[PDB]
């Protein structure tokens, strides 16, 4: 029971690293570089 | 010498805890505070002895209440957990059904003798000559024991344990080749007796990977 | 040249499937050993090679496709391997027959579009693999 | 005493070969995302602490054989 | 020794390219089939 | 007995099952006395003698050392040809130019498995069943043991399985149960006192 | 070795899976009006 | 008339029926006592006799035609008809030690009856059965990939 419970809890706390470390910022998953974003602002600031 | 020193530190910390906990109830006359007297009660009673020593580990568990974001993260975990209220049930049901099927298929067929020359448990008695590393010139006398596999399918609980180990993807080839060699109710194995029995393991692996990738997609990716 | 519209290509697809079955029922024995089935399959593969070498032989009319070049390489390698065993490590060169089932993705448009989609949907995630190789090289040098 | 400086030669590459257009942002945004939520790692730390203490308390006495899974390299006898 | 270690590219391609394909088979069978069961009950909850 | 050991040295026996074949042959020559004549042959698309003898030899201490030394030198390579292996074996039993035992004629086949019954050779070389054929299937494999079982059944022989090293010592001595069958049926005329060679107690 | 399994597979495997499946969800918005999303909503009420 | 099937007591009795059926199957173990086999080999006999009775009740009260409308009803009648074959072959001359094991697995399919009315698992299987046609191409590509590397490995390391 020690090892099985530890494995399940470890796998349950590893899901919190996918729902709170990667899915927290969706502004990059569907970045859509073609139309608009922050890259244009960064390039304009650098040219300025 | 080290163990005695650490015992004196427990006296000091518990004294600090017990002089502060009574202060809290002075301004009262909410629910997580019950764990606060839970730990102090364990320590003084500690002064089965093996249970009080293992139950006193809940020191960092009450640090959640004093922290702001820690309680929010714990509540988010408790909300997250209910998301898979359905899948986590169907996967358990499928594991139980596959455990019962495996019990029917490999009931008692995983036994084997210490020397790979006796098939019946009646022939696996006494001593035998074992040759180390396959060398015929270096024999050693060993006793033969009619042993059973560590992860067998004798009953439903053992089948569930074996299938869980398979679903963790660890040691599953060894179990697969043990089941391929599985002969009969109370006899030893034969090299590649029934290769086709791997369909059971392959199907179980496929439909467990499908589900584990189904409750992980609609949890983090949806 | 004019009859090759639909009955002819289904024949080629079924021949490829039969060749896959024959190549799957071949038992690789250790150190030149064999049985009767392997000899019969070796005799059968002549027919398959004769048909697959005539496919491009009667293919004039197509030359720049990414699949026709693979077909030509398979045909030339098979011929060079068959002519290298009649006059006499030729067994190593026989590993090109496993590329014949790769023709099935070209003969099925539903598979052809899916392969192109899966190969074109992994260009944006290339940077990740670059970082993987970067870290692997750093850790190898550190080791 | 001489290895610490000699090892540091490998890290002179990254400062100049990380300048690719896009990889900088890819690393930078994700390290910001990781640093933005440090409380979730505290749960894993507490889990490991609790389970390690329990393991050393209830399995810590077992000896270290050389053909066993509990050996000089794998044991419950020490917190690390 | 020698060129016996050059046949270890077979197990790398089979692992890297075989695991990749499995993602596109298992992610596409849940992203667009598990999200289809979200709107499925959305219209069933509208009638409830 | 006029023993003659046939060893399969085809490609399929390479690996562990060649180690057991060489050990089973070595532990079987230990059951041959000075009155028994033995020779060892091998076949892989071609049958040849494994040693320098080329005919049945007295199998004394010196001769058995040569055969034992020559057995632990054979390599597995080539295809299997049972007709050529048995034709070569049946020709050495019919030599009669050299000194022999003029007694039990037996052929021992140490192999793994095949699909060739070679029934055209047994109907040509021994129609009267004057030569016993004992067949051994050695190693862990899945090859067809049917023809190997049939070979030992038509020719008054026996079929033996040697999967691992533990079965080598006991399976290489049970062939004397078969060879003692005619002596039992003789009755009182087979009960004659014999004396061994000089040996250390 | 510990840092090689944390920075290595664990982390990066997070990136590969997040980025790959990020486009699957992105394609769903394209799929939302490509010809299946409205069809599935149609064939769930008539069956009931 | 029609209220002997939709009644709450009928469904709550079917739940207990399925629970007993699965308890008789999941109670097997290696070296089980003979009395457990007796009490377990007659339990299916009294359960198959009662399940067949319920099938007869439901067949002649709802109509012979409307029964084979949902996929689950055909599954249930298939399971019930397969149980009859198992009960008679194990008593006739045909022994089938492996055939016995396969038939007892069929009786394990009755547990799906209690999960039938969950309104969520049906959506999962419905979505899969309607979406397998749009990914059979990718699954066949994966299988072709498997076959190609199986043959290549057989050639290289055979
Ligand atoms: C819990 C809270 C944190 C949770 C973390 C969650 C994520 C999981 C990450 C796990 C990383 C674990 C890596 C640490 C392992 C260190 C180790 O193996 O060292 C143990 C070793 C004991 O040596 P020993 O066998 O007693 O014999 C000594 C010979 N004279 O040597 C020592 O004991 C060295 C001295 C100890 C102090 C430095 C070692 C690191 C301590 C742990 C750091 C991470 C926690
Ligand atoms: C979903 C519901 C129906 C669960 C039903 C519970 C039983 C099917 C489980 C729980 C208790 C399990 C039993 C737990 C304890 C044991 C004893 C065990 O045998 C022995 O104790 C001695 C073994 C020997 O004599 O060699 C066999 C498995 C068995 C009966 C298990 C068989 C399966 C049982 C009966
Ligand atoms: C010895 O064996 C040979 C063959 O195994 C027998 O055959 C004769 O061999 C001798 C020459 O060695 C020649 O006479 C002929 O070539 C063979 N045939 C005949 C009919 O003689 C031979 O008969 C055996 N016996 C002797 C005394 O040689
Ligand atoms: Ca052979």
Distance from first to last alpha carbon of chain A: 63 Å
> Biggest sheet of chain A, in brief?
none
The structural class of chain A is mainly alpha
For the sheet with most strands of chain F, the description reads:
6 strands, mixed
SS summary, helix count of chain F:
8
Number of DSSP strand runs of chain F:
6
Order of helices and strands of chain A: HH
Tally of contiguous helical segments of chain A: 2
Q: How much is the radius of gyration of chain F in Å?
A: 16 Å
Q: What ligand species are in this complex?
A: 1,2-Distearoyl-sn-glycerophosphoethanolamine, cholesterol hemisuccinate, a molecule of 2 linked components (NAG-NAG), calcium ion
Tell me the β content of chain F.
Answer: 15-25%
Strand order of the largest sheet of chain F: 3-2-1-4-5-6
Overall spatial form of chain A: rod-shaped
Number of strands of chain A: 0
In whole angstroms, how far apart are the ends of chain F? 25 Å
Biggest interface, residues from each chain: E-H, 18 and 17 residues
Subunit arrangement of the protein: part of a larger assembly
In terms of DSSP E residues, the strand content of chain A is: under 5%
Radius of gyration of chain A: 19 Å
Shape of chain F: globular
Q: H/E order of the elements of chain F?
A: EHEEHHEHEHEHHH
3D architecture notes:
The structure is cut from a larger assembly and holds seven copies of chain A and one copy of chain F (201 residues). In chain A, 44% of the residues lie in helices and 0% in strands. Chain A is rod-shaped, with a radius of gyration of 19 Å. The N and C termini of chain A lie far apart (63 Å). With 48 residues, chain A is mainly α. Chain F is an alpha/beta fold and 201 residues long. Helix content of chain F is 34%, strand content 16%. Chain F has eight helices and six strands. Chain F has a six-stranded mixed sheet with strand order 3-2-1-4-5-6. The radius of gyration of chain F is 16 Å and the shape is globular. Chain F starts with a strand and ends in a 15-residue tail after the last helix. The interface between E and H is medium-sized, with 18 and 17 residues. Chain B: Residues 68-86 are cytoplasmic. Chain B: Residues 107-196 are extracellular. Chain B: This is Voltage-dependent L-type calcium channel subunit alpha-1D. Chain B: Residues 144-222 are annotated as: Dihydropyridine binding.
């Amino acid at each position: 029971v020690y090892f099985i419970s530890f494995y399940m809890l470890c796998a349950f706390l590893i899901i919190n690293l996918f729902v709170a470390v990667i899915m927290d910022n969706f502004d990059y998953l569907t970045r859509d570089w073609s139309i608009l974003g922050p890259h244009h602002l960064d390039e304009f600031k650098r040219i300025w | 010498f080290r163990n005695t020193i650490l015992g004196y530190f427990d006296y000091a910390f518990t004294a600090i805890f017990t002089v502060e906990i009574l202060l809290k109830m002075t301004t009262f006359g909410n629910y997580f505070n019950l764990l606060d007297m839970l730990v102090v009660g364990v320590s003084l009673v500690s002064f089965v002895v093996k249970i009080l020593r293992v139950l006193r580990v809940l020191r960092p568990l009450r640090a959640i209440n004093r922290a702001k974001g820690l309680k929010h993260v714990v509540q988010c975990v408790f909300v997250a957990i209910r998301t898979i209220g359905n899948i986590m049930i169907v996967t358990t049901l499928l594991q139980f059904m596959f455990a019962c099927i495996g019990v029917q298929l490999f009931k008692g067929k995983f036994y084997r003798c210490t020397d790979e020359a006796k098939s019946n448990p009646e022939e696996c008695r006494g001593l035998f000559i074992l040759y180390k590393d396959g060398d015929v010139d270096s024999p050693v006398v060993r006793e033969r024991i009619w042993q059973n596999s560590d992860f067998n399918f004798d009953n439903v609980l053992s089948a569930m344990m074996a299938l869980f180990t398979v679903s963790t993807f660890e040691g599953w080839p060894a179990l697969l080749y043990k089941a391929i060699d599985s002969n009969g109710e109370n006899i030893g194995p034969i090299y590649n007796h029934r290769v086709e029995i791997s369909i059971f393991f392959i199907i179980y692996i496929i439909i467990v990977a499908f589900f584990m990738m189904n409750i992980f997609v609609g949890f983090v990716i949806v | 040249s004019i009859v090759e519209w639909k009955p002819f290509d289904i024949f080629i697809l079924l021949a490829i499937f039969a060749n896959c079955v024959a190549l799957a029922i071949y038992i690789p024995f250790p150190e030149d050993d064999s049985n009767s089935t392997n000899h019969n399959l070796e005799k059968v593969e002549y027919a398959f090679l004769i048909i697959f070498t005539v496919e491009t032989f009667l293919k004039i009319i197509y030359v720049r496709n990414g699949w026709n070049l693979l077909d030509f390489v398979i045909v030339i390698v098979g011929l060079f391997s068959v002519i290298l065993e009649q006059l006499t490590d030729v067994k190593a060169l026989r590993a090109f027959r496993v590329l014949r089932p790769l023709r099935l993705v070209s003969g099925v448009p539903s598979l052809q579009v899916v392969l192109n989609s899966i190969i074109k949907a992994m260009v944006p995630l290339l940077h990740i693999a670059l970082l993987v190789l970067f870290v692997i090289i750093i850790y190898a040098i550190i080791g | 005493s001489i290895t610490f400086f000699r090892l540091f030669r490998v890290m002179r590459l990254v400062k100049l070969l990380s300048r690719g257009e896009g990889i900088r942002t890819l690393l930078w945004t994700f390290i910001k995302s990781f640093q933005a939520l440090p409380y979730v790692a505290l749960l894993i730390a507490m889990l490991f602490f609790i389970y390690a203490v329990i393991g050393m308390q209830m399995f810590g006495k077992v000896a270290m054989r050389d053909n066993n899974q509990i050996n000089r390299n794998n044991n419950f006898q020490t917190f690390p | 020794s020698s060129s016996g270690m050059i046949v270890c590219i077979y197990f790398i391609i089979l692992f890297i390219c075989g695991n990749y394909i499995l993602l596109n088979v298992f992610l596409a069978i849940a992203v667009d089939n598990l999200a289809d069961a979200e709107s499925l009950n959305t219209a069933q909850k509208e009638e409830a | 007995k006029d023993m003659l050991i046939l060893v399969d040295v085809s490609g399929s026996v390479s690996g562990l099952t060649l180690k057991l074949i060489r050990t089973s042959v070595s532990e079987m020559l230990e059951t041959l006395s000075d009155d028994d004549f033995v020779n060892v042959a091998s076949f892989n698309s071609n049958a040849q003698d494994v040693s320098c003898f080329q005919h049945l030899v007295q199998a004394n201490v010196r001769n058995k050392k040569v055969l034992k030394d020559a057995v632990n030198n054979i390599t597995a390579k080539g295809i299997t040809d049972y007709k050529k292996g048995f034709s070569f074996a049946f020709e050495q039993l019919l030599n009669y130019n050299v000194s022999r035992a003029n007694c039990n004629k037996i052929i021992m086949l140490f192999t793994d498995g095949g699909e060739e019954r070679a029934q055209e050779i047994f109907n040509k070389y021994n129609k009267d069943k004057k030569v016993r054929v004992f067949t051994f299937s050695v190693g862990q494999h899945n090859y067809d043991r049917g023809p190997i079982q049939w070979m030992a059944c038509e020719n008054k022989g026996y079929y033996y399985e040697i999967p691992s090293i533990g079965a080598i010592r006991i399976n290489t001595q049970e062939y004397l149960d078969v060879l003692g069958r005619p002596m039992v049926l003789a009755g009182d005329k087979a009960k004659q006192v014999q004396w061994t060679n000089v040996y250390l107690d | 070795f510990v840092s090689l399994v944390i920075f290595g597979s664990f982390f990066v495997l997070n990136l590969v899976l997040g980025v790959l499946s990020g486009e699957f969800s992105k394609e769903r918005e394209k799929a939302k009006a490509r010809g299946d999303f409205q069809k599935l909503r149609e064939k769930q009420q008539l069956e009931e | 008339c029609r209220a002997a099937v939709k009644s709450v007591t009928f469904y709550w009795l079917v739940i207990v029926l399925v629970f007993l059926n699965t308890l008789t199957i999941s109670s097997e173990h290696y070296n089980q006592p003979d009395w457990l086999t007796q009490i377990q080999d007659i339990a299916n006999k009294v359960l198959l006799a009662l399940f067949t009775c319920e099938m007869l009740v439901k067949m002649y009260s709802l109509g012979l035609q409307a029964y084979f409308v949902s996929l689950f009803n055909r599954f249930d009648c298939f399971v019930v008809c397969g149980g009859i074959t198992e009960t008679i072959l194990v008593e006739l001359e045909i022994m089938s030690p492996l055939g016995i094991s396969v038939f007892r697995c069929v009786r394990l399919l009755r547990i799906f009856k209690v999960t039938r009315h969950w309104t969520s698992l049906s959506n999962l299987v419905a979505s899969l059965l309607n979406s397998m046609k749009s990914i059979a191409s990718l699954l066949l590509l994966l299988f072709l990939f498997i076959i190609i590397f199986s043959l290549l490995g057989m050639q290289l390391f055979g």
